[PDB]
């Protein structure tokens, strides 16, 4: 009777930036999703492909838990068929997603009087991200036609921008912690049943 380690993901002390979203693999344990679904503490709890209403009687090959932090107005972007900063350049979900998305306000933890500038997002890229792709490069983006030559200046921007997280910001500009659970189903024993 091994319990699935969801405490290390949901109750973690420090989270990762959206461009460097953290991935954890969960296998060979028993998960009680009714505990999460009946917590009355999550602002957003939306599940695609599967029905959240007591459908824990299914066996899955693996569970990928992806953790990051965004602002409130961007939470709508974490869904299939969405466009925007996060969906295009930071975190993209496939159109045939089968999983669960949980997001809750974290203004009491991730905010910082004076500004929490350690949460970043990528603003410039040459092309859109493929689903479940991660980019951690810091190459200078070429906006015009003059090469940057590795230095920043006119039409030469650092590709990362910083969130400004303060307790006095509006709901649309307050931190939100997001955990995405992806359920893999392949020709495998599928040891993750979780009765």
């Amino acid at each position: 009777t091994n319990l699935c380690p969801f405490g290390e993901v949901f109750n973690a002390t420090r989270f990762a930036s959206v461009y460097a979203w953290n991935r954890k693999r969960i296998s060979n344990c028993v998960a009680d999703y009714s505990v999460l679904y009946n917590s009355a503490s999550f602002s957003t709890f939306k599940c695609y492909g599967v029905s959240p209403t007591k459908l824990n009687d299914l066996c899955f090959t693996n569970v990928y838990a992806d953790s990051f932090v965004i602002r409130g107005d961007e939470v709508r972007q974490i869904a299939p068929g969405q466009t925007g900063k996060i969906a295009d350049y930071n975190y993209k979900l496939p159109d045939d997603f089968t999983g669960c998305v949980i997001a809750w306000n974290s203004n009491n933890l991730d905010s910082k009087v004076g500004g929490n500038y350690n949460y970043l997002y990528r603003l410039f890229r040459k092309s859109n991200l493929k689903p479940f792709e991660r980019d951690i490069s810091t190459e200078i983006y070429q906006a015009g036609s003059t090469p940057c030559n590795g230095v920043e200046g006119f039409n030469c921007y650092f590709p990362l921008q910083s969130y400004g997280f303060q307790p006095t910001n509006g709901v649309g500009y307050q931190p939100y912690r997001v955990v995405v659970l992806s359920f893999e189903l392949l020709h495998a024993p599928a040891t993750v049943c979780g009765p």
Partner: antibody
Amino acid sequence: QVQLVESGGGLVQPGGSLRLSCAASGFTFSSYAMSWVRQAPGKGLEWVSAISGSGGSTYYADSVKGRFTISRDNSKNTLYLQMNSLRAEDTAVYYCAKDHLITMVQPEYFHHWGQGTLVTVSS
Amino acid sequence: DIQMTQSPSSVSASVGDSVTITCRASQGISRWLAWYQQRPGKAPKLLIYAAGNLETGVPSRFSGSGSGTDFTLTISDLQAEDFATYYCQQADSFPLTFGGGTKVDIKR
């Protein structure tokens, strides 16, 4: 896991200059924010300065600002602290500190510490 | 502007007893606080970060609690290697500030 070694400490006269160096091995040097923290011979700890994983942002205390300058070289994996207009109150042991997690703009915590170099100021 | 106050300045305890140390902040710093331990002639070592999160190698007899303004560090089963100086540091506003320090001594 990582290893931080500090050097450059010594004996200088009041009003002189010094350059302290911190060499780091075992991690991506450009993804972490570095800090300089000093401890007086018989007093407590005091945070001195901080850099931000690049060089864009530099943070100084209200007692070293105007005299200290922090910089880094990511190609050589080194960190430099230039101290000018030194007085007797600057006699302390200096530590090069860094946090476990990937912090790019702000120091936060200090999980990794170096050996420290004693800097004496006297005539 | 964000000065932090420790209490008490010094305490005495015997092996097997428990010690409590309080750290207060001028303004709310949420849970941006760290507890450090230092022995004479050596570099400081981290014990607690966040507010009560344990470090991977620290013995499980160190506990931390509190939030906002008050914070508390607790040593449950005191041993012979737990006589040192402890500091509380905030990490929410610049410049970063350290606590005064509390020394734990042998009682006789």
